[PDB]
Amino acid sequence: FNVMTKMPGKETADRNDPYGETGFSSIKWYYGILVKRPERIAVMKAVAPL
Amino acid sequence: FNVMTKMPGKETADRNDPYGETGFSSIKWYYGILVKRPERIAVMKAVAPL
Amino acid sequence: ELKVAFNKDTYVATVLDASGSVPSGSVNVGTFFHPDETYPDSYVIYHGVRELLYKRSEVDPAQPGFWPENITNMQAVTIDNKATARLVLNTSLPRVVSTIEGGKVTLSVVALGGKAPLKYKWEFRAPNASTWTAVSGQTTANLVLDNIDADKAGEYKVTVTDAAGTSVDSTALVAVGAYPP
């Protein structure tokens, strides 16, 4: 998990926001799964009582 | 020449892109000329074959 | 509903009203509520044009677009406003007024918005009730209560409505001490 935050102030003030009254915090990550053996996974599906 | 380069990541992350995965590289310079004696520069014009 | 147009050459975002005529060259890019419905006193017209050109295309500011190709350079655009100024209350009613039975309480409201026929309204809630009762007669700004009785106490609320739809209100609770008859 990679987290990027920029608190308001001299770090968010730019030519589109000369004052700097905003911030954000973005978290992104890379995920993937490789299944080498589908035979080794079993799923039984059924309905359940209410 | 003046090359300014910002890598994707920390530098280029505004409101527009919170995750911040856009970089660039800009080159800019300054050129000018001064014809001190515009009599020693001669141009002869014609057409050329195919 | 302020309608925004945009000419791609001069980079002029004309913020027209709901019944404007797009300039020759500009193209409809969207609409937004200048007095934002939820947060009414936080965003300005610029804060609504930016949310409208982000979903646009540099190649042609008529088709929608997103991050890699959109109008996000907010320095070349020059917002040219032609939408009526928001109905604002320059001087609202005082929070509280308090006189004695027989005195004269006057309330005044000043509005600076956009319309020719800025019509007014007046209501009155008794201090045990739940619904507002129409104050008949007085419909022009200053409301004068002369020889005020005890029954004429409670809360008064003006309602400055412009020509098309915009309205702004402000209340003023009125108290009157009642000496024994």
Contact C174, C135 (CB under 8 A): no
Backbone angles phi, psi at C48, to 5 degrees: -115, -30
Chain B residues in contact with A17 (beta carbon < 8 A): 15
Q: How far is C18 from C107, CA to CA, in rounded Å?
A: 34
Beta bridge partners of residue A2, listed in sequence order: A28
Please report all neighbours of B, defined by 3+ CB atom pairs within 8 A: A, C
Q: Report CA-CA distances (Å) from A48 to A41, A44, A45, C8.
A: 22, 12, 10, 60
Determine how many CB atoms are found less than 10 A away from the CB of residue B50.
Answer: 2
Q: How far is C85 from C2, CA to CA, in rounded Å?
A: 11
User: First CA to last CA across chain A, in angstroms?
Assistant: 38
Q: Report CA-CA distances (Å) from C171 to A45, C58, C97.
A: 63, 48, 11
Q: How far is A49 from C181, CA to CA, in rounded Å?
A: 75
Q: How far is C5 from C90, CA to CA, in rounded Å?
A: 30
Q: Report CA-CA distances (Å) from C170 to C89, C106, C114.
A: 8, 14, 18
Q: Interior CA angle at C96 toward C91 and C97, to 5°?
A: 95
Question: Which two three-digit tokens encode residue B19?
Answer: 């995750």
Question: Which two three-digit tokens encode residue B30?
Answer: 């300054």
This structure was determined by: cryo-EM
Backbone angles phi, psi at A21, to 5 degrees: -110, 35
Can you tell me which residue has the tokens 């060259």?
Answer: C25
Q: How far is C155 from C125, CA to CA, in rounded Å?
A: 5
Q: How far is C50 from C56, CA to CA, in rounded Å?
A: 10
Determine how many CB atoms are found less than 10 A away from the CB of residue C82.
Answer: 14
Contact C29, C70 (CB under 8 A): no
Q: How far is C138 from C144, CA to CA, in rounded Å?
A: 9
Could you give the count of Cα atoms lying within 13 Å of B10 in the half-sphere of its Cβ?
1
Residues 6 or more apart whose CB falls under 8 angstroms from that of C129 comprise C154
Burial C89-121 (b: 16+ CB within 10 A, else e): beebbeeebeeebeeebebebebebbbeebebb
Chain B nearest C-alpha distance from A46 (Å): 41
Burial B15-31 (b: 16+ CB within 10 A, else e): bbbbebeeeeeeeeeee
Q: How far is B31 from B47, CA to CA, in rounded Å?
A: 30
Chain A nearest C-alpha distance from B16 (Å): 10
Element (H, E) at C173: strand C167-177
Backbone angles phi, psi at A34, to 5 degrees: -115, 125
Chain C nearest C-alpha distance from A16 (Å): 6
Select from B19, B21, B22 the residue whose CB has the most chain A CBs within 10 Å, as the one to mutate to test that interface. B19
Contact C9, C20 (CB under 8 A): no
Please report all neighbours of C, defined by 3+ CB atom pairs within 8 A: A, B
Q: How far is A5 from A14, CA to CA, in rounded Å?
A: 16
Chain B residues in contact with C54 (beta carbon < 8 A): 16
Find how far residue A28's CA is from the centre of its chain: 4
Q: How far is A14 from A11, CA to CA, in rounded Å?
A: 8
Identify the contact set of chain B against chain A, taking CB-CB distances under 8 A: 10, 13-15, 18-20
